[PDB]
Amino acid sequence: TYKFVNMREPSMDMKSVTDRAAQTLLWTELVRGLGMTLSYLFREPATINYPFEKGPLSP
Amino acid sequence: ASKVKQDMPPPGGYGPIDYKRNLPRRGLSGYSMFAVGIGTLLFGYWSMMKWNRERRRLQIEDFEARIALMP
Ligand SMILES: CCCCCCCC/C=C\CCCCCCCC(=O)O[C@H](COC(=O)CCCCCCC/C=C/CCCCCCCC)COP(=O)(O)OCCN
């Protein structure tokens, strides 16, 4: 069993072409990436306070 | 006495694990975005029209005061 990763064909009707042009001229995916980074900013960091805190170990 | 005890999955197994790609569409057509842009441009144009006409009248008033003071 195998999968195709990049075998899609964009639709050439007027609405989809207009959507792609709006993405180009208004940078929608760039704001999407900005928003994901912003959401990542507002969560707790994963940093521990060494040497007062230590990483987990095992026997 | 004691029985075998080692790491094994719990009875019934584990729950399903999500692995498919999940990139949902935020959702807004290009027509709507272009319409919003053109609408805010037109609103700015109208406000600037009114404000700059008022500024022209104010400048004319100031020039009138200067003309009166000139002699
Ligand atoms: C009815 C009368 C109306 C009067 C006319 C008005 C028409 C308005 C409609 C059209 C205007 C839109 C133009 C705005 C700028 C467009 C520039 C542009 O689209 O360039 C992009 C590229 O632009 C970029 O990629 C720049 C990205 C830079 C990376 C940083 C991301 C920035 C986004 C963060 C927010 C930006 C904040 C902007 C406002 C800040 C104000 C202080 C095209 O490049 P490609 O997609 O690679 O394809 C070209 C080859 N065919």
Side-chain angles (χ1 to χ4, degrees), chain A, chain B residues 1-24 27-71:
Chain A
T1 61
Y2 69 105
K3 195 183 288 188
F4 275 127
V5 292
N6 210 10
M7 203 45 117
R8 291 281 191 100
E9 176 67 28
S11 167
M12 267 327 257
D13 60 8
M14 192 53 169
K15 202 248 213 195
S16 295
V17 173
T18 303
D19 277 2
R20 285 197 298 277
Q23 174 176 359
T24 299
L25 293 182
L26 306 176
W27 318 334
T28 58
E29 92 287 23
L30 304 180
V31 202
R32 206 145 163 220
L34 279 183
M36 176 84 95
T37 329
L38 177 80
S39 90
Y40 225 96
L41 155 79
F42 280 116
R43 57 180 97 175
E44 204 181 347
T47 307
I48 71 176
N49 186 5
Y50 188 82
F52 314 94
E53 268 142 56
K54 306 300 201 83
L57 281 181
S58 72
Chain B
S2 292
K3 63 135 193 94
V4 165
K5 169 94 226 73
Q6 62 181 172
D7 225 341
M8 302 282 326
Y14 289 107
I17 283 166
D18 272 48
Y19 68 97
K20 302 277 200 67
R21 170 197 274 177
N22 191 268
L23 265 70
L28 202 48
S29 183
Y31 292 135
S32 296
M33 309 214 248
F34 283 132
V36 169
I38 301 300
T40 184
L41 277 186
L42 291 181
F43 180 73
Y45 293 168
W46 174 261
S47 203
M48 264 333 268
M49 242 187 303
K50 295 326 217 73
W51 181 222
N52 277 349
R53 281 167 195 175
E54 180 55 37
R55 292 167 86 201
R56 290 314 286 255
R57 287 188 292 269
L58 295 166
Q59 191 203 37
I60 280 171
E61 191 188 346
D62 199 323
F63 284 1
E64 257 179 8
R66 179 214 179 216
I67 276 173
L69 275 185
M70 273 186 115

